[PDB]
Amino acid sequence: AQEKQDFVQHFSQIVRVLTEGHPEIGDAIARLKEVLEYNAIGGKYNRGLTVVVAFRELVEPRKQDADSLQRAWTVGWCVELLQAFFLVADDIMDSSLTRRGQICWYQKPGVGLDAINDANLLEACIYRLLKLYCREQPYYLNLIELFLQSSYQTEIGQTLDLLTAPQNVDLVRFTEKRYKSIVKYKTAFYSFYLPIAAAMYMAGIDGEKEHANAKKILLEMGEFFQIQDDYLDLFGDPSVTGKIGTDIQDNKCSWLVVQCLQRATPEQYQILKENYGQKEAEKVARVKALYEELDLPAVFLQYEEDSYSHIMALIEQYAAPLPPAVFLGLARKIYK
Amino acid sequence: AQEKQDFVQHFSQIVRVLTEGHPEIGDAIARLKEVLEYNAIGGKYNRGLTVVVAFRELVEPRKQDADSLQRAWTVGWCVELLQAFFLVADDIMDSSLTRRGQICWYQKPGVGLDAINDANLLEACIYRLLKLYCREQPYYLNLIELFLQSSYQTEIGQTLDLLTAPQNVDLVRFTEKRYKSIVKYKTAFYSFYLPIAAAMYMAGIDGEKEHANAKKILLEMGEFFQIQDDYLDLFGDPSVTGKIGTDIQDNKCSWLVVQCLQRATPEQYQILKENYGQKEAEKVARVKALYEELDLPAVFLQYEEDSYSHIMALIEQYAAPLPPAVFLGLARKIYK
Numbered sequence: 226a227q228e229k230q231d232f233v234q235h236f237s238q239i240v241r242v243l244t245e246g247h248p249e250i251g252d253a254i255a256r257l258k259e260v261l262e263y264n265a266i267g268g269k270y271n272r273g274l275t276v277v278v279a280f281r282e283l284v285e286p287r288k289q290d291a292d293s294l295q296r297a298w299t300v301g302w303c304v305e306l307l308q309a310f311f312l313v314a315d316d317i318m319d320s321s322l323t324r325r326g327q328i329c330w331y332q333k334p335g336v337g338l339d340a341i342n343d344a345n346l347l348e349a350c351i352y353r354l355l356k357l358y359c360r361e362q363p364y365y366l367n368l369i370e371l372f373l374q375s376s377y378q379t380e381i382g383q384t385l386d387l388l389t390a391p392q393n394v395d396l397v398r399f400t401e402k403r404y405k406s407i408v409k410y411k412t413a414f415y416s417f418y419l420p421i422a423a424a425m426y427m428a429g430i431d432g433e434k435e436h437a438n439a440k441k442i443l444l445e446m447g448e449f450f451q452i453q454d455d456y457l458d459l460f461g462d463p464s465v466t467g468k469i470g471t472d473i474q475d476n477k478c479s480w481l482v483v484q485c486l487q488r489a490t491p492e493q494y495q496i497l498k499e500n501y502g503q504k505e506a507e508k509v510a511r512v513k514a515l516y517e518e519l520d521l522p523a524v525f526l527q528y529e530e531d532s533y534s535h536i537m538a539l540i541e542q543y544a545a546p547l548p549p550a551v552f553l554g555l556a557r558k559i560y561k
Numbered sequence: 562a563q564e565k566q567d568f569v570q571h572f573s574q575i576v577r578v579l580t581e582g583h584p585e586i587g588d589a590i591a592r593l594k595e596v597l598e599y600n601a602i603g604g605k606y607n608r609g610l611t612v613v614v615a616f617r618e619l620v621e622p623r624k625q626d627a628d629s630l631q632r633a634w635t636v637g638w639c640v641e642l643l644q645a646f647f648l649v650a651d652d653i654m655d656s657s658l659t660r661r662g663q664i665c666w667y668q669k670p671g672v673g674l675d676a677i678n679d680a681n682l683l684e685a686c687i688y689r690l691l692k693l694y695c696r697e698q699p700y701y702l703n704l705i706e707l708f709l710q711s712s713y714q715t716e717i718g719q720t721l722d723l724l725t726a727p728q729n730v731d732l733v734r735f736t737e738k739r740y741k742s743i744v745k746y747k748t749a750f751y752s753f754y755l756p757i758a759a760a761m762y763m764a765g766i767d768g769e770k771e772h773a774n775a776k777k778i779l780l781e782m783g784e785f786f787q788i789q790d791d792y793l794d795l796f797g798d799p800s801v802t803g804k805i806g807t808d809i810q811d812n813k814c815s816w817l818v819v820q821c822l823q824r825a826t827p828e829q830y831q832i833l834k835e836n837y838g839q840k841e842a843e844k845v846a847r848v849k850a851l852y853e854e855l856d857l858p859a860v861f862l863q864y865e866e867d868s869y870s871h872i873m874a875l876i877e878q879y880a881a882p883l884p885p886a887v888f889l890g891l892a893r894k895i896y897k
């Protein structure tokens with residue numbers, strides 16, 4: 226909330242600029258506006274904010290002029306638009322209903338599958354903003370390359386997930402090797418690496434060793450973030466989190482299920498194969514209870530402590546010559 | 562067919578390279594292969610070929626080494642991948658059934674809406690190929706900018722079309738101003754301008770006057786191409802064309818309907834408002850017949866002659882200092 230204020234006020238500009246002497250596309254543009262208003266707003270904006278906070282921590286207080294700052298808030302919003310893009314499109318693919326307690330864009334009367342083209346525009350906006358605000362800067366190409374690669378990392382990932390978890394009831398697919406691989410591609414690169422990485426390029430730090438080291442820390446934070454994300458879906462107090470859960474109820478390849486699958490006598494595979502993915506609550510319950518009887522909440526605690534220790538070693542070994550404050554900023558947030 | 566041979570043999574490489582020491586994404590990559598094989602192949606490859614033919618016509622026979630040529634066949638394939646991307650995604654949005662006489666990707670058993678992520682990968686491949694083959698070249702950024710802008714031109718366009726023509730039976734929307742605007746954004750930039758424009762950049766011709774002039778010729782060729790595309794859907798002998806038509810049968814904003822709407826007594830608006838968009842053949846027929854009784858086939862002939870004259874004036878006035886052979890190559894094809 227120290228720099229969240231200005232970030233969200235700058236949105237109104239993002240839209241002003243994306244929406245304008247080419248008269249008869251005017252209507253398409255109208256609709257672009259509606260799209261962004263509804264789909265870019267209403268999150269907690271952490272990823273986009275990471276770019277701003279990191280940019281401030283990374284630069285000479287000298288070279289942080291109004292223009293510099295203009296570009297940090299933008300490239301921050303470019304990340305929130307990348308996300309909206311995956312989110313709109315995944316929500317169609319998963320046949321989701323709500324998101325941020327609010328009806329999904331594609332479920333709205335009159336949108337439906339038009340949401341496909343809408344998502345594509347969310348993505349297109351990224352590269353419009355980069356041209357409008359950074360075409361001049363030494364790191365212009367680096368930012369295009371980054372976003373593009375982050376998109377591809379993410380898409381490869383979603384493909385893996387879909388292949389793993391048919392919305393075709395199968396647990397043989399749900400392995401640790403595979404789960405780590407899904408999380409890395411689908412959530413970790415775009416959620417942890419993209420934003421620090423963007424800030425670094427903006428700072429003129431483009432050595433692929435520096436990035437090699439930053440990615441290493443960040444990708445592991447990404448694993449924890451998701452593994453914690455999967456724990457809370459079930460056991461996390463829904464008021465503390467802000468969501469009912471459908472990890473079991475929707476045949477997801479959770480961390481939970483992966484670890485239960487690693488730790489279960491055949492007689493237990495069945496009770497899981499019997500009620501994982503069912504709509505009935507009676508069924509949703511007799512997995513939860515199996516998880517509880519495998520002390521998995523306790524196995525999570527064990528992983529959280531290890532993970533934590535490890536992030537700090539990685540920060541110790543690889544943050545240099547960046548301020549650890551970049552990493553500890555994130556670590557603080559995610560280890561709540 | 563003079564240079565179509567090598568173009569289609571080079572595909573096999575395109576795939577070899579897009580699909581490879583990161584072991585557990587291996588499956589996602591498998592699937593990418595399936596995606597491209599099925600969706601990049603089976604067209605007539607005109608747009609991608611335009612890049613190759615234009616590259617040859619545009620360069621010093623000196624500077625056309627194996628490497629140069631390697632990059633022309635690629636950036637040609639980059640265009641065929643852009644198209645596959647719009648095509649897969651539009652075919653979902655339109656609830657289409659077949660395409661190239663062949664079941665659409667999304668209708669295949671096990672694909673469905675996963676086709677969304679599949680289309681996104683088709684698009685991602687463009688930028689992988691550009692990095693793999695051109696990162697070094699002076700025009701690398703120009704080609705990224707071009708493709709990105711061509712994507713956005715196209716998406717803006719599809720948005721306009723969707724807004725115009727709810728798959729909501731309305732003719733008031735179907736105007737000439739609007740039709741020209743749909744065709745320009747949705748089909749003309751990516752089909753005519755992208756490929757000549759790509760070849761020019763590859764040739765080191767990047768002046769925005771040169772491109773200003775090339776786009777002018779090409780966008781008008783784009784209008785004709787589509788306007789002819791809409792004529793043939795109905796009256797075009799389906800063996801000469803290679804498609805049954807559902808321009809009327811699917812409430813499309815055709816050239817036909819636009820011109821019939823411009824030329825019709827109220828008593829005729831009704832007969833159109835009565836049977837445009839109906840599945841029944843009896844209904845599909847009593848529009849066709851209205852079109853015939855408005856001598857629209859004859860109005861098409863009148864437009865084809867004018868259009869033709871005009872393309873040549875535009876070529877006369879704006880081709881320089883490019884070989885007219887670049888433009889007359891296309892004009893020859895499209896004016897069949």
Ligand SMILES: Cc1ccc(-c2cc3c(N[C@H](Cc4ccccc4)P(=O)(O)O)ncnc3s2)cc1
Pocket residue numbers: 268269270271272275416417453454457466555558559561
């Ligand atoms: C780079 C980066 C850094 C921090 C975060 C955080 C997300 C988050 C958060 N998420 C919400 C959902 C959620 C995720 C994980 C745990 C609990 C709730 P949403 O996506 O509805 O804003 N909730 C509470 N604190 C945090 S911190 C994300 C990315």
Ligand SMILES: Cc1ccc(-c2cc3c(N[C@H](Cc4ccccc4)P(=O)(O)O)ncnc3s2)cc1
Pocket residue numbers: 604605606607608611752753789790793802891894895897
């Ligand atoms: C830049 C550019 C230049 C020429 C073409 C052509 C397409 C085409 C063509 N299309 C087929 C469909 C069709 C379009 C227009 C008229 C008749 C058929 P498809 O997309 O199944 O390959 N058929 C016959 N000749 C041609 S020439 C496209 C782009």
Ligand SMILES: [Cl-]
Pocket residue numbers: 292293
């Ligand atoms: Cl400046």
Ligand SMILES: [Cl-]
Pocket residue numbers: 628629
């Ligand atoms: Cl070379």
